[PDB]
A paper describes a structure:
The responsible exoribonuclease is Usb1, which removes nucleotides from the 3′ end of U6 and, in humans, leaves a 2′,3′ cyclic phosphate that is recognized by the Lsm2–8 complex. Usb1 is a member of the 2H phosphodiesterase superfamily of enzymes, which contain two vicinal active site HxS/T motifs that are essential for catalysis. We examine the structure and function of Usb1 from Kluyveromyces marxianus, which shares 25 and 19% sequence identity to the S. cerevisiae and Homo sapiens orthologs of Usb1, respectively. We find that the origin of CPDase activity is related to a loop structure that is conserved in yeast and forms a distinct penultimate (n – 1) nucleotide binding site.
Subsequent trials were performed with N-terminally truncated Usb1 by removing the first 58 amino acids (residues 59–275) that was designed to mimic the crystallizable S. cerevisiae and human orthologs of Usb1 (5,11,14). The structure of KmUsb1 was determined by single isomorphous replacement with anomalous scattering (SIRAS) methods and a uranyl acetate heavy atom derivative. The asymmetric unit contains three subunits, each of which is essentially identical in structure with an average alpha carbon pairwise r.m.s.d. of 0.63 Å for residues 61–275. Consistent with previously determined Usb1 structures, KmUsb1 retains the canonical 2H fold, with two conserved HxS motifs buried in the central cleft between the transit and terminal lobes in a very narrow channel that is just wide enough to accommodate single stranded, but not double stranded RNA. In addition, two glycerol molecules are bound in the catalytic pocket as high-occupancy ligands (calculated values are between 0.87 and 1.0), where one of the expected catalysts (His211) forms a hydrogen bond to a hydroxyl group of a glycerol molecule. The active site of KmUsb1 is similar to ScUsb1 as both have a 310-helix loop architecture in the n nucleotide binding pocket (residues 207–209 in KmUsb1) which is absent in HsUsb1. In contrast, this loop is much larger in both KmUsb1 and ScUsb1, with an overall positive charge and includes a 310-helix structure. The overall K. marxianus, S. cerevisiae and human Usb1 structures are highly homologous, although KmUsb1 more closely resembles ScUsb1 (the r.m.s.d. values are 3.1 Å for 182 aligned alpha carbon residues between KmUsb1 versus ScUsb1, and 4.1 Å for 159 aligned alpha carbon residues between KmUsb1 versus HsUsb1).
Author numbering: 61 to 198, 202 to 275
Write the structure that this text describes.
């Protein structure tokens, strides 16, 4: 369908029981601040209905829109082969710094995130380099400067207002979570760490695994 000839690369982060409980209390605390300030709350991304588990992610490419099935296979195969040829056998994922808020492509959703640590970004640099080499030439770039894990997602209440009003409320939301909702970030950063032994790629409607 719409996803024909679309590819995207990412890391999958499955949380253990302790990490799930930490994210419950961190997000509850953030959302108490959102309530106090009459802001939209963040839906936790690590849980579904009835506490069904959902993995978290690190995006490693933009949405890659290839011109045809042949180019999809040519470029994704080269990506897979070159990632396999890397020396590394696993990459660490750990977080550094404060809350970030990233918008999706139509600004309808605002994701509460933390950036990757300097060593985590450094170990992913050779992966990003491979993606940059093979991705289609064909507006939300993924790069070393913005690698992150998103933990919650809120609706943009200002989606249909003037762009400048929506951007102002986004910047004051970013300031609000940083100034008033950051006290449990040391607990999050100490515990939300992972080691990934494979990448994933969405290709069309299928997901493939790319071993390290």
């Amino acid at each position: 369908p719409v996803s024909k000839n679309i590819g995207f690369l990412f890391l999958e982060l499955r949380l253990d029981s302790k990490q799930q409980q930490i994210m419950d209390l961190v997000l509850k605390g953030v959302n108490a601040v959102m309530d106090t300030h009459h802001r939209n709350s963040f839906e936790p991304l690590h849980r579904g209905k009835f506490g069904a588990m959902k993995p978290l992610h690190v995006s490693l490419s933009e949405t890659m829109m290839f011109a045809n099935e042949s180019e999809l296979e040519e470029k994704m195969g080269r990506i897979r082969q070159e990632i396999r040829a890397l020396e590394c056998k696993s990459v660490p994922v750990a977080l550094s710094g404060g809350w970030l808020v990233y918008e999706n492509f139509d600004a309808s959703l605002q994701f509460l995130a933390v950036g990757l640590s300097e060593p985590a970004r450094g170990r992913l640099k050779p992966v990003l380099s491979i993606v940059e080499k093979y991705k289609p030439r064909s507006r939300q770039p993924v790069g070393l400067n913005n690698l992150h894990v998103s933990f919650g997602v809120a609706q943009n209440a200002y989606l249909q207002q003037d762009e400048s009003v929506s951007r102002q409320r986004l910047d004051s939301l970013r300031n609000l979570v940083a100034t008033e909702a950051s006290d449990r970030l040391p607990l999050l950063r100490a515990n939300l760490q992972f080691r990934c032994h494979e990448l994933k790629a969405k290709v069309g409607t299928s997901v493939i695994t790319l071993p390290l």
